[PDB]
Each structure stands twice: as C-alpha cells, then as structure tokens.
Design a protein around this nucleic acid. Structure first.
Length: 139
DNA sequence: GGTAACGGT
C-alpha cells in the first residue's frame, strides 16, 4: 500500500501513515494513542487550548486522532510506545466515534488478515522530516 | 470491544 497524510484519510477506509505520538494511555481494556502529523482533518476532534490538560504537548484544533489498540497491539505497545515517539502505522481501520469524529483502530488479527502494523520510527529518519517541518510552521 | 480528547496508572 501507499501512505496518506492524516489530512487525507477518511472513515471506514484502511490507511497507512507516519505520525508523532502526543499522548498515550493504557487501560485494563486497551491501549490508546493520540497522534498527529500536523496536517488538519475536518473530521478530527477540535482539541481545546482552554480545557485540555496542561500536559498536552500537541497542536490544537482538528489536528490529532485517537488510535485504539486491542489485543496483540495492546500487549506489544502499551509499555513500549512513548509520548513523543514517532510511529509508522499500516493498514489500520478507521471509523467514527459516538460523537462524529474520525478515529483509528487496530483490532485483534491473529491471522494477520489485514496486514496491520505499528512500529517505532527512529527520530532521525528522513521519513519524519515533513512532520517536523509542518510543526515548525505550526508553532 | 471503549466511547472520551481526564489520568500519569
């Protein structure tokens, strides 16, 4: 497959992309990431500069997306993928949450039917230059 | 599957 900017993704179509992890949270059910590539998407949650946790080091407005990791993806990443990290995510499922916003899902797939993956990208890879340059323009 | 843009587990 080929990669999309997060501006370009749509619901209920699998997609692949590079992003920076802004926030992580593991729970007894799953592992949740909130990631950005500093491109805007009209179906993304508008993050408030006002009501957001002071911890949030990400952008505001429709710039970030929730990724929910289940099962093997939970187990793999929950103590591994850190806030601030870069990741490449491949063939992940997209849908709409209860409030109308786009989100990413990595569901259990022991057969690797859909060839989903998530892996860290070393900070120094050129594949991450764009995110970096778009962040500069953002700040 | 969880369902909200918390927490810091």
């Amino acid at each position: 497959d080929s990669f999309s900017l997060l501006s370009q993704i749509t619901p209920h179509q699998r997609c692949s992309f590079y992003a920076q992890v802004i926030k992580t949270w593991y729970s007894d059910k799953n592992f949740t990431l909130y990631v950005t590539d500093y491109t805007e998407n009209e179906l993304f949650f508008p993050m408030s500069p006002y009501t957001s946790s002071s911890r949030w080091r990400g952008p505001f407005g429709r710039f970030s997306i929730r990724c929910i990791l289940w099962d093997e993806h939970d187990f793999y990443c929950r103590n591994y993928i850190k806030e601030g990290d870069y990741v490449v995510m491949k063939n992940v499922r997209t849908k709409i949450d209860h409030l109308g916003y786009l989100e990413c899902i990595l569901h259990g797939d022991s057969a690797k039917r859909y060839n989903m993956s998530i892996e860290k990208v070393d900070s120094e890879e050129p594949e991450l230059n764009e995110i970096k340059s778009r962040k500069r323009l953002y700040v």
